[PDB]
């Protein structure tokens, strides 16, 4: 009995919106199957023979029934389903690893940028060029309005 305990809201967080129905069906399946497994014990109570040895006056019917039962090996079904989901898991892990590395790169870059902004020049000592380089939103569009004051008059 190899089961993996699970959160469920953590499951709910990681369902891309294209397949919420499939996943919800899977959750329902999980719970109904758990109940079904609880709905019956592990192994059947094997029939004793004495109660039928001393009661079934039929010749060799009880005997050969018991024996062919002993001579019966119920086919334990093999999955062939798990290995492929394992491979799918593998690929997903790879994609998540590359995505997360890219995100860590973006993260350290944001960090460097924030640190630049953190090491600012005291504003009173700051030439307009340093304000410009600190915020491109403080840069006159000398291209689109080439004459003074290079911006909408009313905007002043």
């Amino acid at each position: 009995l190899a089961l993996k305990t699970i959160d469920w809201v953590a499951f709910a967080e990681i369902i891309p919106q294209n397949q919420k129905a499939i996943a919800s069906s899977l959750k329902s399946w999980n719970e109904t199957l758990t109940s079904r497994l609880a709905a019956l014990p592990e192994n059947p109570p094997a029939i004793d023979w004495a109660y039928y040895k001393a009661n079934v006056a039929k010749a060799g019917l009880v005997d050969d029934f018991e024996k062919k039962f002993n001579a019966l090996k119920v086919p334990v079904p093999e999955d062939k389903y798990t290995a492929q989901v394992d491979a799918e898991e593998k690929e997903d892990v790879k994609s998540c690893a590359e995505w997360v590395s890219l995100s860590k790169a973006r993260i350290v870059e944001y960090e460097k940028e924030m640190e630049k902004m953190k090491n600012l020049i005291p504003f009173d000592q700051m030439t307009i060029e340093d304000l410009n380089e600190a915020f491109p939103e403080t840069k006159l569009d000398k291209k689109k309005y080439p004459y003074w004051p290079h911006q909408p008059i009313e905007n002043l």
Partner: protein, 198 residues
């Protein structure tokens, strides 16, 4: 390159304090006033400075301008400093807001990391369902086989016992309806039992 705080310490808006301290060790508090009055009396007397309507004018203008500064000076001063401090506060708020924006971006990316880390519950749920379904099918098979074998066994023992019942009841009814057809000896026994009344 910052601005030095203050100006030059001019006096009357016409003479800087450098001149007064310049003369201080030589004639001190009586130097400049005397030099000024002497020079002005000179320029008056020797027809150096002509007195005409221009005096009327320039005195009116000096008067207007002295009243002007002395009245509306503080207002323009504090308006200037208003403009400066306001621009400064606005720049500080732009800075803080940008810092906070990028910090939010960082924390959101970290959240992305946490979730895509959490991802694997999907695959372990799939695994769980697989194994559970398999063992369910197996146990169902075992109970199927035990059920069918028990069913055949019961069936046989049941028909056996039912035949036992039917034959037994038929036998007892046979013997009752058969003994009937079969001596005053019983009558003598009746008189004996009655004699046993007491």
């Amino acid at each position: 390159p910052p601005l030095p705080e203050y100006g030059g310490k001019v006096r009357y808006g016409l003479i800087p304090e450098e001149f007064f301290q310049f003369l201080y060790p030589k004639t001190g508090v009586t130097g400049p006033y005397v030099l000024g009055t002497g020079l002005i009396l000179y320029a008056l007397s020797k027809e150096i400075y002509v007195i005409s309507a221009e005096t009327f004018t320039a005195l009116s203008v000096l008067g207007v301008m002295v009243y002007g500064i002395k009245k509306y000076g503080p207002f323009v001063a504090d308006f200037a400093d208003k403009l400066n401090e306001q621009k400064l506060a606005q720049l500080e708020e732009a800075k803080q807001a940008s810092i906070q924006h990028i910090q939010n971006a960082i924390d959101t990316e970290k959240s992305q990391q946490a979730l895509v880390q959490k991802r694997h519950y999907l695959f372990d749920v799939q695994r769980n369902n697989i194994a559970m379904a398999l063992e369910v099918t197996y146990r169902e098979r075992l109970y199927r086989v035990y059920k069918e074998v028990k069913n055949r066994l019961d069936y046989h023992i049941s028909v056996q016992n039912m035949m036992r019942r039917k034959e037994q009841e038929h036998m007892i009814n046979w013997v009752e309806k058969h003994v009937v057809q079969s001596t005053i000896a019983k009558c003598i026994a009746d008189l004996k039992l009655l004699a046993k009344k007491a």
